[PDB]
Structures are given as C-alpha cells and as structure tokens.
Amino acid sequence: WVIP
Amino acid sequence: WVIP
Amino acid sequence: DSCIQFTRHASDVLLNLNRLRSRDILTDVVIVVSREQFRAHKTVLMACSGLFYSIFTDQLKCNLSVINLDPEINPEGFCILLDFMYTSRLNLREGNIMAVMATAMYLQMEHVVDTCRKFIKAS
Amino acid sequence: DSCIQFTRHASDVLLNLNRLRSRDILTDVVIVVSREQFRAHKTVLMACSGLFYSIFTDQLKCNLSVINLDPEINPEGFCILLDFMYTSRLNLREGNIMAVMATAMYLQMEHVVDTCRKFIKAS
Ligand SMILES: CN(C)c1ncc(Cl)c(Nc2ccc3c(c2)CC(=O)N3)n1
Ligand SMILES: CN(C)c1ncc(Cl)c(Nc2ccc3c(c2)CC(=O)N3)n1
Numbered sequence A, B: 001w002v003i004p
Numbered sequence C, D: 001d002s003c004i005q006f007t008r009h010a011s012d013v014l015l016n017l018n019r020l021r022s023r024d025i026l027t028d029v030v031i032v033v034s035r036e037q038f039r040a041h042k043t044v045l046m047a048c049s050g051l052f053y054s055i056f057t058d059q060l061k062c063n064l065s066v067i068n069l070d071p072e073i074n075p076e077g078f079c080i081l082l083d084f085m086y087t088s089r090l091n092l093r094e095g096n097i098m099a100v101m102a103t104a105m106y107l108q109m110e111h112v113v114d115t116c117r118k119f120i121k122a123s
C-alpha cells in the first residue's frame, strides 16, 4: 500500500 | 514497454 | 517466453472498466445492501472478492441478476470497497475503518483486511 | 482525496480475468477470425480495443454473441493480441510482427501499433  |  | 510487456496496460484496463461502470455499460448484476443498490460487472466482482468468486462460479447463482448481501453489511462500507475494486484506491478513514474491515472480511478481500488490521493496531 | 493505493491491484485483477478466460467462465462473446473461434469477455475487449469499444457501445451490436472480423485478419495475429489484452505481454517476433501490427491497427490498439512501428524502424 502507498500514498498515490 | 519493458523486458519482464 | 521472449515477450515484451506494457507497464501501464493493467491500470489502463481497470480505468476503462471503471468508465464502463460509471456509464452503466454492460453491467450484468445489482448488489443489494439494505435499501441501497449497486450495479457492477460480475467478472470484476469475482476478480476482487473471494465471496463473489464463489457465488458466480456456482451453476445456479451465476445466472442471477440480483444478489442480496447479509443485512449486517453497511452500504457505505460496500460502496468504498466497490470503488477500490474498480480503482485500486481505498478511502479508509477513522469513521469508516470498522465498517470497511467487517465488509472486506465478509467479501473475502484479504489485502484490504490486512491494511485495516495494521491501521487499527497503530491507533 | 486522502485514499491509500494497493500497487498490485490492477495486475491481480487482470491475472484473475485471464484465469476466468482460460476456464471459459462468464465469457459472453465468440470472435470469429477466418475458420478460428476465440471466446472472451466483452468488457475486457472494450477496455483494450477502440474497435470493440465502438462495436459493443452500439445499441444493436452490444447484444450479439458472435462477431466476425474482416477476412484479411490473420488468426495468429489476433491470438497474440488477445493474449496481450489479458496479460500485458506481447509475443512479438520477426515472423509475426507484420500480422500483429496490421491486426493492432484494425483493432485500434494504439500502444501495440506504436511498439511495432519502432521495432520495424530499428530493423
Ligand atoms: C483462486 N482462483 C483460481 C481464482 N480464479 C479466478 C478468480 Cl476471478 C478468482 N478470484 C478470487 C478468489 C479469491 C480471492 C480473491 C479473488 C480476492 C481475495 O482476497 N480472495 N480466483
Ligand atoms: C474513450 N472512452 C471514454 C472509453 N471508455 C471506456 C472504454 Cl472501455 C474505452 N476503451 C477504448 C477506447 C479506445 C481505445 C482503447 C480502449 C484502446 C486504444 O488504443 N483506443 N474507452
């Protein structure tokens, strides 16, 4: 999971 | 396009 | 093999499937959650959820145009998860995280359940 | 928005759609190319091809279970492109590149046409  |  | 690969292809496919969903093109099922109705593509639901995969591989249920979820399922939690299925983006907030995790456990979306558990553990 | 994103989601969705194709699950169309028949999902075809997007948004053609391509289309070129649609992988070889480029131009798959032009220019 990432900060888009 | 890339070499997978 | 000796294939070449187009990096953005999967993301572009998903973006177009979401465009079809927003315009209600070739949607073949309505998911009923309490009073709320959500139109979608059976194949996308199966690709994202262990529960929908089980439902639509069943010889009788594969032909249903309407699926009613368990009355305990919250419509907002479902809406957030449906948006994730079509975009890879999860709108996870303090006020919705419990409803999102419970809906993801019911839908059998392992990666969503994993990030909810981690975010709850941190707080 | 304040969303989080799962990097592998789009690729995982496409991998599952290809698994459904290989098992012939919820395929809703047969594409006829000369004598050869190819089963697929209308939504995936539309998401990948400008030609299928035009065909299946048409109020009459959207309901067809069989689509016949132009007799000039080579079945091998089509098979390679169908595999690309479901995997992001293109089996481009010296012996098939002309048939692949011609099929991609007909199907309106701009990124495939672009890599074929570049590979031809190099040789
Ligand atoms: C497991 N299998 C062969 C398969 N083939 C095709 C599809 Cl569409 C599919 N989808 C599916 C099944 C289980 C789960 C998911 C999708 C997401 C998840 O967390 N569990 N799973
Ligand atoms: C252009 N548009 C709004 C849109 N919405 C939904 C879909 Cl499924 C779609 N697909 C499509 C159209 C044109 C082209 C492609 C897909 C691939 C391409 O090279 N050209 N295009």
Ligand SMILES: [Cl-]
Pocket: C048, C109, C110, C111, C112, C113
């Ligand atoms: Cl997931």
Ligand SMILES: [Cl-]
Pocket: D048, D109, D110, D111, D112, D113
């Ligand atoms: Cl393309």
